[PDB]
Each structure stands twice: as C-alpha cells, then as structure tokens.
Amino acid sequence: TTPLVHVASVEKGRSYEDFQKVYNAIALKLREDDEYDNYIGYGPVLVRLAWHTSGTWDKHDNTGGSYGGTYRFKKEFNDPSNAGLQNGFKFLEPIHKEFPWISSGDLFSLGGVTAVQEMQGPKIPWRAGRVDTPEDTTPDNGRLPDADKDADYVRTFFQRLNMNDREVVALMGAHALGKTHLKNSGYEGPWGAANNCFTNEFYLNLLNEDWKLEKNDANNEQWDSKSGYMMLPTDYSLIQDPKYLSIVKEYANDQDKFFKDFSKAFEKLLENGITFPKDAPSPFIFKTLEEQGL
Amino acid sequence: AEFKAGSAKKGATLFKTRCLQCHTVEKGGPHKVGPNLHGIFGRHSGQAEGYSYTDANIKKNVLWDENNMSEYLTNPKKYIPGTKMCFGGLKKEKDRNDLITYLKKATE
Amino acid sequence: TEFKAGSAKKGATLFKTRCLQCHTVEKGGPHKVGPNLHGIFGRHSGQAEGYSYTDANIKKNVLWDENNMSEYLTNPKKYIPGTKMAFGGLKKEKDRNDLITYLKKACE
Numbered sequence: 001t002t003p004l005v006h007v008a009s010v011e012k013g014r015s016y017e018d019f020q021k022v023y024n025a026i027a028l029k030l031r032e033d034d035e036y037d038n039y040i041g042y043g044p045v046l047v048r049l050a051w052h053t054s055g056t057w058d059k060h061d062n063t064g065g066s067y068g069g070t071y072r073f074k075k076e077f078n079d080p081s082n083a084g085l086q087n088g089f090k091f092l093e094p095i096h097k098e099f100p101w102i103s104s105g106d107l108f109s110l111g112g113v114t115a116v117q118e119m120q121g122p123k124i125p126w127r128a129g130r131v132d133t134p135e136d137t138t139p140d141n142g143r144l145p146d147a148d149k150d151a152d153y154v155r156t157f158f159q160r161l162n163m164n165d166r167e168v169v170a171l172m173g174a175h176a177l178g179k180t181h182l183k184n185s186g187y188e189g190p191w192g193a194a195n196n197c198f199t200n201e202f203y204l205n206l207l208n209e210d211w212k213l214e215k216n217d218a219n220n221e222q223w224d225s226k227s228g229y230m231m232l233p234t235d236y237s238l239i240q241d242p243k244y245l246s247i248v249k250e251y252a253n254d255q256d257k258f259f260k261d262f263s264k265a266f267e268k269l270l271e272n273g274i275t276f277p278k279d280a281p282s283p284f285i286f287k288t289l290e291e292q293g294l
Numbered sequence: 295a296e297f298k299a300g301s302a303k304k305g306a307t308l309f310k311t312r313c314l315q316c317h318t319v320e321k322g323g324p325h326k327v328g329p330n331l332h333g334i335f336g337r338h339s340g341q342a343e344g345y346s347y348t349d350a351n352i353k354k355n356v357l358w359d360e361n362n363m364s365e366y367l368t369n370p371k372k373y374i375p376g377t378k379m380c381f382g383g384l385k386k387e388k389d390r391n392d393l394i395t396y397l398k399k400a401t402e
Numbered sequence: 403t404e405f406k407a408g409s410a411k412k413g414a415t416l417f418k419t420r421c422l423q424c425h426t427v428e429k430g431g432p433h434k435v436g437p438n439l440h441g442i443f444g445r446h447s448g449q450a451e452g453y454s455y456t457d458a459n460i461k462k463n464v465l466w467d468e469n470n471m472s473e474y475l476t477n478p479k480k481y482i483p484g485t486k487m488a489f490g491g492l493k494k495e496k497d498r499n500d501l502i503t504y505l506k507k508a509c510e
C-alpha cells in the first residue's frame with residue numbers, strides 16, 4: 001500500500017535492569033580486552049560501529065538506519081566503507097551470546113552508547129526496541145560519507161540524516177576517539193593524543209595546530225600537524241566553512257556545551273527511522289561502572 | 295599504595311606500550327603530549343620546567359615517591375581530579391610494581 | 403628570476419584542483435568566491451572590477467609580480483593578514499613554480 005514504518009517493540013518482560021546488565025557486560029569487556037589497537041581499546045571502533053550502522057538511513061524513504069540491524073548480513077558487512085568494523089562486530093558476538101534476547105540493532109547502538117559513557121563522555125539517553133529485519137532489507141553500499149570532500153558535501157550529506165549544522169559539528173567531535181588506519185580507510189593517524197577519552201580535543205586541535213595538507217602512503221591527501229595528528233579533508237572543512245567554524249570555536253571553548261549537543265545528536269542519530277509508541281518508556285540513562293563503585 | 299620491587303624488564307614493556315605514547319624518560323628528553331619524566335621521583339607534581347601542566351596537577355603538590363606514584367597510576371583522574379592525562383590506570387599491583395621499578399631506574 | 407619557472411601542465415591541474423573552486427582566469431570570466439584572476443600580473447592587489455575585497459586586500463596594494471605572488475601563495479594570511487581567502491598555502495616550491503608558470507600563461 002505505502003512506505004515503511006518501523007515500530008519500536010521491546011521484548012516481553014525486558015526492562016531497564018536487563019539493558020543495564022548488557023551495558024555492564026560491554027563495559028567490562030572493554031576493560032578486560034584492553035590491548036586492542038595498541039591499547040586504545042575497543043571503545044572507538046564501537047562508537048564508529050553504532051554510527052555506521054545508523055548512518056545508512058535515508059530520511060526520504062526510511063530505508064537503512066539502526067532499526068533492522070542489517071550489518072549482520074554479507075552485503076553491508078563487506079561495504080568497503082565499513083573496513084575494520086568487523087572488529088567491533090567480533091567484540092560484541094560473545095555479548096550477544098550471553099544475552100540472546102537483545103536485538104542486533106539494539107546491541108550495535110547500545111555498544112556505541114556504552115563506549116561513549118565509559119570513555120568519560122556525556123550520558124546518552126537510549127531507547128530499546130529495535131527489531132531485526134530480513135536480509136532483503138539490507139541497504140546497498142554507498143550510503144556512508146566520503147572523507148575526501150568539502151563542507152558543502154558534508155552539509156548536504158548530513159541533510160539526508162535530518163541533521164543541521166549544530167548537530168553535524170557536534171557529532172563530528174566523536175573524532176576525538178581512536179584514529180584512522182591506512183589499511184582500513186586509506187588515511188593514517190590520530191586526530192589527537194587522548195584517543196580513548198571523550199573530550200573536545202577535536203575542536204581544540206582543529207583550531208590550535210598548524211596544519212599542512214600532504215599526501216599519505218595510500219596517495220590520499222590529509223591535513224597533518226607537527227604534533228603527529230591528522231584531520232580528514234571533511235574534518236578540516238569545518239574550519240573552512242564560516243558557519244561551521246563558529247560552532248567549532250564554541251565547542252573548543254566550552255566542553256559542557258559540546259557534551260550536551262553531542263548527547264542529543266547521537267541519540268537522534270541512533271533513533272532515526274524509528275517510530276516509538278506514545279506509551280513507550282522514557283529513554284534509559286545507564287549508570288557508568290564508576291558510578292557503581294565499580 | 296605500598297611499592298614493592300618488581301621486574302624492570304616487564305616494566306620497560308609496560309612503559310613502551312602504555313606510556314611512551316606521551317612521555318620520554320631520558321635526562322633532558324623532550325616534553326611531548328606529556329612531561330618528560332626524568333627526575334620525577336623526589337620532585338613535586340607539576341614542576342617539570344618547560345611543560346604546561348594542568349592547574350589540578352600542580353595544585354596536588356605531591357612530592358612523588360614510589361608509593362604515591364603507585365596510587366596515582368591505579369587511577370589518575372581519581373588521584374588528581376581534572377588532570378588532562380588520558381589514562382584509565384594500571385589496575386594490577388604487579389603491573390604497577392614492575393612499571394615503577396622500571397621508572398625508578400630509567401629516570402633515576 | 404629568484405623564482406624559477408616550471409611545468410605549466412602541472413601548474414594547470416594544481417590550479418584546477420586547488421584554486422578553481424574559487425577562481426576563474428579566462429577574460430571576462432566571472433568572479434566566484436574569489437576574483438576573476440585575468441590580467442592579475444602587472445595589476446595592483448585589490449583592483450579586479452565589481453568584486454568586493456576586504457579592505458586588507460586593497461590597503462596592501464602590491465603589484466602582482468611572480469615574486470611577491472609566490473610569497474603570498476605560501477601563506478595568504480601571513481602575507482595579507484585579514485585577507486578572507488581561505489587557503490592553507492603551497493608549501494612546495496615546484497608547486498609554486500608549476501602553478502605560477504601556469505598562471506603566468508593563463509591570465510595573459
């Protein structure tokens with residue numbers, strides 16, 4: 001008859017205590033398997049995983065998005081845009097086996113929320129209820145952003161995710177986490193030095209480092225600084241565009257502000273495409289391990 | 295925390311894998327993301343000449359020794375709230391002892 | 403000259419790749435973010451017609467010769483602080499040679 005709607009349905013009897021148990025499981029494994037990627041740990045790749053699985057959404061026909069958890073299928077799993085994400089998938093496998101009742105999309109998104117919180121970032125309210133959909137619902141590759149582009153490209157790309165200037169700049173601050181790996185994306189290097197702590201370092205480095213546009217070993221160009229950091233062409237476009245620059249500057253000078261906006265934008269990202277019943281529960285705000293005397 | 299002598303070799307590996315990213319240990323070595331650590335034991339926190347410390351680190355005004363260093367490395371932000379050093383900490387005593395045994399030697 | 407002179411096929415792609423988004427060189431060519439660059443060389447900075455220049459580009463009034471032009475491209479904001487041209491600069495002499503040479507020829 002007409003267009004797709006995805007209704008949030010949380011499994012019977014499953015509530016906040018259940019999901020907090022899953023959060024804890026991820027947070028614990030994040031601490032136990034700490035050697036990954038030269039001790040950066042799996043936090044950054046989990047955040048990138050939550051973003052890539054949600055970022056396939058197209059607001060115009062409601063295809064893609066985190067709802068269906070389709071990254072588990074071949075086509076999306078092998079999207080070149082997802083090179084390296086297999087690591088986050090493997091990290092979460094045992095977790096899913098311990099908690100078989102949680103949906104795939106619910107697990108991928110919760111993984112990003114847990115990683116952000118456990119890396120001392122802002123609390124990200126989260127809502128359960130994503131439901132696995134058949135392989136046929138797997139979007140084709142090509143929906144994630146190219147990093148070799150400019151501000152106009154970034155702005156129009158994010159319009160497809162219903163994101164505005166503020167939301168775009170805030171979400172990009174996640175690049176404070178982890179690093180680019182030449183074998184994965186054709187780009188190499190960290191955006192900063194505090195790779196596994198969620199801060200506003202991305203904006204600070206963008207504004208305070210001396211950047212030089214250079215070719216890397218994969219023959220792509222990236223902006224490099226003397227400190228050994230890098231910025232993708234799309235990251236640097238945030239100080240090339242005037243509108244974006246003003247927001248970069250305000251986050252560079254106010255982390256609490258960045259945190260609040262990032263929290264709102266990341267949850268929105270994670271919930272795009274999802275219709276939540278009006279009688280559905282208020283979003284959950286999980287306690288960190290630290291907050292549990294753990 | 296109470297330091298107990300350990301393995302300098304294993305401590306060297308811990309340092310290389312967990313600290314070198316941001317710190318050098320040789321005398322006259324350069325500051326990097328973090329302060330060069332030569333002469334760290336016996337000096338007060340935030341006194342490395344030429345490095346821009348956080349306000350919190352300097353105010354801790356801790357005269358570094360093997361014991362409070364062990365306490366610090368167990369949970370940096372906990373011991374010095376607001377420090378900008380990004381590091382969750384070495385939770386195992388054995389790990390902290392091997393590392394400090396090495397640091398005592400490498401810096402000395 | 404003090405500035406050498408290079409390949410103009412290279413300069414061409416460098417210009418198409420790094421300057422084209424904002425500037426034309428053809429005669430009559432339309433201003434974009436940047437002024438039409440036709441007959442740049444031999445003119446004073448800030449003269450293109452019916453293009454609005456930051457007072458900074460006007461008040462510097464320098465004749466554009468392949469030499470002051472190369473100092474400029476290395477770092478547009480150091481050269482004409484306040485300029486609004488959003489370019490990081492060409493850190494490579496060949497590039498600068500290669501480009502200028504191209505320009506020399508394209509903006510005749």
Ligand code: HEC
Pocket residue numbers: 193194195309312313315316317327328329334338339340341342346347348349350351367376377378379380381384
């Ligand atoms: C990602 C960065 C990074 C890593 C990894 C890191 N540090 Fe630090 N460290 C810093 C920074 C930055 C400071 C400055 C703290 C401040 O000013 O708040 C610092 C400060 C310290 C201090 C206090 C120095 C003084 O003079 O007061 C000690 C001691 C220290 N680090 C030891 C180590 C050891 C040992 C390790 C590893 C087990 C380590 N650091 C890992 C960045 C790092």
Ligand code: HEC
Pocket residue numbers: 416417420421422423424425435436437439442446447448449450454455456458459475484485486487488489
């Ligand atoms: C993103 C925008 C942008 C880019 C990239 C760019 N330009 Fe500019 N250019 C401008 C603007 C805007 C101005 C005027 C600046 C002002 O008024 O301060 C300008 C001014 C100039 C001027 C001075 C014009 C005059 O009449 O004095 C020259 C010469 C020039 N650009 C050449 C170049 C070259 C060569 C490149 C690339 C290698 C380049 N531009 C890249 C936008 C750009």
Ligand code: HEM
Pocket residue numbers: 044045047048051083084145146147148154171172174175177178179180181182183184185186187232234266
């Ligand atoms: C213009 C949009 C974006 C582009 C082009 C982009 C591009 C990239 C690329 C090229 C990498 C390196 C991958 C690798 O080589 O391992 C990466 C990593 C990462 N991105 Fe982005 N990104 C974008 C938006 C985002 C957003 C919105 C988030 C999350 C909110 C995000 C989170 C991450 C994380 C945390 C990593 C580090 C992964 C790791 O260390 O394994 N990115 N991104």
